[PDB]
Amino acid sequence: PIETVPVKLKPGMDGPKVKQWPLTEEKIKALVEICTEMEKEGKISKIGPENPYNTPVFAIKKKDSTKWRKLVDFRELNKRTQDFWEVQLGIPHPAGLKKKKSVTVLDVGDAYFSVPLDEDFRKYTAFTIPSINNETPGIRYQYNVLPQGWKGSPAIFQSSMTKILEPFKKQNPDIVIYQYMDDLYVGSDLEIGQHRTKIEELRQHLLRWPFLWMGYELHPDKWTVQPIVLPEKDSWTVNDIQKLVGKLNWASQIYPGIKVRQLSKLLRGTKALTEVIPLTEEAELELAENREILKEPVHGVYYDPSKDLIAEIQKQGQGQWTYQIYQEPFKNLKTGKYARMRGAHTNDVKQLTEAVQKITTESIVIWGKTPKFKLPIQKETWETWWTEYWQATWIPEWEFVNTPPLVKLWYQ
Amino acid sequence: MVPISPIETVPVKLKPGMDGPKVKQWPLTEEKIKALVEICTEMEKEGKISKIGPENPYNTPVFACKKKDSTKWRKLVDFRELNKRTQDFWEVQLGIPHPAGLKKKKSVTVLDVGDAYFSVPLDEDFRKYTAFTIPSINNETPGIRYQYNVLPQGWKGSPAIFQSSMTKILEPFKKQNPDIVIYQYMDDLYVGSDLEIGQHRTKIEELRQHLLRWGLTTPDKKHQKEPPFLWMGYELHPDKWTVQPIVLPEKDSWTVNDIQKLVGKLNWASQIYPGIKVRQLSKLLRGTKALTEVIPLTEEAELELAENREILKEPVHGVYYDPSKDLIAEIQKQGQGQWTYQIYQEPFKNLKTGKYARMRGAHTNDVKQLTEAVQKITTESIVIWGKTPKFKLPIQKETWETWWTEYWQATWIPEWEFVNTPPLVKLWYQLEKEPIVGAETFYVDGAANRETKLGKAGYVTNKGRQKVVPLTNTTNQKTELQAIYLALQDSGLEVNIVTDSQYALGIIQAQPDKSESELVNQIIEQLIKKEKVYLAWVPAHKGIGGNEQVDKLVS
DNA sequence: AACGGCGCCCGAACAGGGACTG
DNA sequence: CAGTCCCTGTTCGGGCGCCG
Numbered sequence A: 001p002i003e004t005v006p007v008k009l010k011p012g013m014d015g016p017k018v019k020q021w022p023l024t025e026e027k028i029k030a031l032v033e034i035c036t037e038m039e040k041e042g043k044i045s046k047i048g049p050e051n052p053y054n055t056p057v058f059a060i061k062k063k064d065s066t067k068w069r070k071l072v073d074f075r076e077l078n079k080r081t082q083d084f085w086e087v088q089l090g091i092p093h094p095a096g097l098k099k100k101k102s103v104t105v106l107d108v109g110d111a112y113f114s115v116p117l118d119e120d121f122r123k124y125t126a127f128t129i130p131s132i133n134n135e136t137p138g139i140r141y142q143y144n145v146l147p148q149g150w151k152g153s154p155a156i157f158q159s160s161m162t163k164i165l166e167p168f169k170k171q172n173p174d175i176v177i178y179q180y181m182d183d184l185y186v187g188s189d190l191e192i193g194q195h196r197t198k199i200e201e202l203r204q205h206l207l208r209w210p211f212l213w214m215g216y217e218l219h220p221d222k223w224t225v226q227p228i229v230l231p232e233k234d235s236w237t238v239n240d241i242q243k244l245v246g247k248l249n250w251a252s253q254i255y256p257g258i259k260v261r262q263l264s265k266l267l268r269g270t271k272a273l274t275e276v277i278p279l280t281e282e283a284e285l286e287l288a289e290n291r292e293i294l295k296e297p298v299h300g301v302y303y304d305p306s307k308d309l310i311a312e313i314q315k316q317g318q319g320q321w322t323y324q325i326y327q328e329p330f331k332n333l334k335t336g337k338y339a340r341m342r343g344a345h346t347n348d349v350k351q352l353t354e355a356v357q358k359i360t361t362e363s364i365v366i367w368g369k370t371p372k373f374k375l376p377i378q379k380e381t382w383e384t385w386w387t388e389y390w391q392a393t394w395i396p397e398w399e400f401v402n403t404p405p406l407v408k409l410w411y412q
Numbered sequence B: 001m002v003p004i005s006p007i008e009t010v011p012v013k014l015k016p017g018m019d020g021p022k023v024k025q026w027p028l029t030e031e032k033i034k035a036l037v038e039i040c041t042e043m044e045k046e047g048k049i050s051k052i053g054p055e056n057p058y059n060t061p062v063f064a065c066k067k068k069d070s071t072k073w074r075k076l077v078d079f080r081e082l083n084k085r086t087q088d089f090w091e092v093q094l095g096i097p098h099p100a101g102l103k104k105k106k107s108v109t110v111l112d113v114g115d116a117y118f119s120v121p122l123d124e125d126f127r128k129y130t131a132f133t134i135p136s137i138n139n140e141t142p143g144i145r146y147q148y149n150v151l152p153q154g155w156k157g158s159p160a161i162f163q164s165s166m167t168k169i170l171e172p173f174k175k176q177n178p179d180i181v182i183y184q185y186m187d188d189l190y191v192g193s194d195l196e197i198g199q200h201r202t203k204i205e206e207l208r209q210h211l212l213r214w215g216l217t218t219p220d221k222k223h224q225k226e227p228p229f230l231w232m233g234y235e236l237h238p239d240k241w242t243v244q245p246i247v248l249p250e251k252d253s254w255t256v257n258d259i260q261k262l263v264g265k266l267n268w269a270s271q272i273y274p275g276i277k278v279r280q281l282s283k284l285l286r287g288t289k290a291l292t293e294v295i296p297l298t299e300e301a302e303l304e305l306a307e308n309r310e311i312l313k314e315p316v317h318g319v320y321y322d323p324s325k326d327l328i329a330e331i332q333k334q335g336q337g338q339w340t341y342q343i344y345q346e347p348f349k350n351l352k353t354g355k356y357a358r359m360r361g362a363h364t365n366d367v368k369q370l371t372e373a374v375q376k377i378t379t380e381s382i383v384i385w386g387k388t389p390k391f392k393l394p395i396q397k398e399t400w401e402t403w404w405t406e407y408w409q410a411t412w413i414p415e416w417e418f419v420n421t422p423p424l425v426k427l428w429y430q431l432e433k434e435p436i437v438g439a440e441t442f443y444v445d446g447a448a449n450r451e452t453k454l455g456k457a458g459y460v461t462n463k464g465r466q467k468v469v470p471l472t473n474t475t476n477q478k479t480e481l482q483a484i485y486l487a488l489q490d491s492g493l494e495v496n497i498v499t500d501s502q503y504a505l506g507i508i509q510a511q512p513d514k515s516e517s518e519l520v521n522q523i524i525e526q527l528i529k530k531e532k533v534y535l536a537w538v539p540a541h542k543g544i545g546g547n548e549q550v551d552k553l554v555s
Numbered sequence C: 001a002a003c004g005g006c007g008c009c010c011g012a013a014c015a016g017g018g019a020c021t022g
Numbered sequence D: 001c002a003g004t005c006c007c008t009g010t011t012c013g014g015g016c017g018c019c020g
């Protein structure tokens, strides 16, 4: 009884044609059980090879959850419908969400399964379930309703979501509610007891209309930043000063007031690296002035909503991971550091996966965008393992880099 | 008025703005003429082919080739122009079934659908785009032109449509027989069950009659009831499997196309024969671009080919997959960037073997390549068994721990244990984390002229040691590596080295043990001989310490 | 002389960053 | 500041194996 909102691709772009990648046994058995129930409910329908489109599919388990969750990699389809969920029916981003003391994330993507999908657009949501040892050919489906993980789903459902959240927002004018992909970000300054009570009231408000029982909690008021800091030693060697001048010279690309004149004068000659060099009066002055500039904020650094976010991550060792978010080089909007995450001291890929999820979550809360990641890892290493550790219902864009640490800039 | 088959049709369109095929026939031999007129007549009576007239302004040439191990001929339609104008299909064939992924079944039957493509109907509105003429005489009778009501052999949409149509017909039977495994690859059907031999034939006949309801025939000439079964090019025995006998050519003179077929068979043989190498054979397939050019076999390529033939002498076999037992994968280093592995569940009962010999990167080490081999085995194991095997690797836990904790890139190996079988993989040198007290400090630098390709490389040290070496036909990057090589040559067992070259430092910090560059291989040899090496980097052209001094010498 | 599938080893074309020269 | 170079990386299409 609902008219299908017409959906069109961006002009001059065809649908996605991405090959399905191999899935483990437990993931194939999970998707077969899930898709059988979705077909019986009419959410998806089987298709044939005359549909040349395809999008990868796999399954995940959220944190502290033993239930399998179907996850479609609509990253290609999403950027082929960008003029829809950003120009036509965009979702405004509240600047106060990052200021709330607590923010709960609610998986509301199940609600999208009640709105029909435009018939002329269903062919683009095609996916293929693989089989172990290629016992059977791929089992292809397409979506009949708004699919989870597609950016067009929250945009079309937004009019329905507004009406559902209308009584709750009136009841609580202080609560900030933001919607991104399949998730609902609910932030309040209420105490932990009061917050979770208000979250449960929102859950019951949605029930009177399979992962609604979960609530991942955030605290953006506690989110820290990792500035560039200079070492403080009692004695300085030639090697210490060479590293310091190297760090300051690179930091000058960000802070143009940094000077290295007096510090470089300490190395006049051809000295042994372990020779102790006493800091002169001017050297102490220049180093003290540089420590103050690194505390001052960078000039002309602000968020441009028209530009993409970019995230770089550095493996610092011993479970330490630093990251920077920016839109223009050396104009970082945020710098941080993670330590002692899951997989620390045993699994780089799990740690890097966790870091990508944390950074993306922070970017959704602060700006409402996900960044494109520059991952310090080989493509084959990441693509072999990352789905084993993914616990989010969205997927960011990423590319692969290899930058040897010539100077430890973000972590001494 | 042709009957409609029970198989649901597949709606096939064309790319917009384009029409059907209009290609003239190809003059063929009279032997092919007397082998196609009988086909178009039999398919006309059976309804598989209808005759058209002048209202079909299309044409497409066809040819015929003998079937493999059969008196019957095979007809193929050259739809290369139709495929360029036909819509794209998504292939539902995602891979190739492997016998090592099969589980033990008490009873096994291998079927083969007769006239596969000729039993699935074509789209109604698409049959008009398949026009072709058949001259009864090579230059006398104009020949009546026919069309296709089924899937033609040669059309790019025929495989995908048949594989999807076959699945829809088997789905009700598989739902009625859950405990029966049916491996479905193209028209061949592998059917296995733990039922008794008598009860197994009962369900087989039920399946043969189920397919018959949709017009799919399973003749007796390609019905296999007795092991060994010929399936996907393998010999399936009740408790083991092996590849069909592989014959390597033995020509007195070897060209280029002969080696391409030789390395191919060896790649196919490496899935069950342990220890196959194709490094030196494929090394001959470089530079020369003439498939009909004779290439002499090198002494290394001859010894490699000899050791592969002796491996193929003794008969080998794989076993089947038992899900109640764990998956084990063990790797050995074959030398020269070559790795071989075995996947098994019980000791000395290999499910399959394989090799990894890809050389990626100009500079690398054994640990990187072992990590790549693990990733290849992992992905291969998820395709075949849907799970990652436990690894047995010839690398110490301490060696691996030192590498991955200190490497700047994320790297990881799944659950694994150390197996002490030389040659063990190790790191051949370790760069110091701090400058060395008492070791001479070398400030190195190199510069080259872009035009004349002339350059200098040298160093200055804290003790007054100094060298400048003029170089010809070089680059800035080469002179920076040469400067480090000079400092390693002229220093004691412990040395500190300060360079401004991000290029050189990036190579050496990754601890390579092999390189396509002779200069880097010489630098590695020096690094192995040292007891302590500390590399430090400073920005160039900043008046920093001895770097400012050696910069003057070389520029 | 046809189509589709997967695997390997090869080279040409292309991309991207330090670094030098106008 | 651009436009090159040197060098190293990925992508892709074809060679071969093999299946149908």
Ligand SMILES: Cc1cn([C@H]2C=C[C@@H](COP(=O)(O)OP(=O)(O)OP(=O)(O)O)O2)c(=O)[nH]c1=O
Pocket (backbone or CB within 6 Å): B112, B113, B114, B115, B116, B117, B118, B153, B154, B186, B187, B222, C003, D020
């Ligand atoms: C071997 C082969 C096969 N095919 C297509 C056609 C039918 C299926 C199976 O071929 P087949 O089993 O050998 O012959 P088929 O048509 O089934 O007839 P039968 O010999 O089984 O009776 O794949 C093809 O297009 N080109 C080929 O070279």
Ligand SMILES: [Mg+2]
Pocket (backbone or CB within 6 Å): B112, B113, B114, B115, B116, B187, B188
């Ligand atoms: Mg057949």
Ligand SMILES: [Mg+2]
Pocket (backbone or CB within 6 Å): B444, B445, B446, B480, B500, B501, B540
């Ligand atoms: Mg230099």
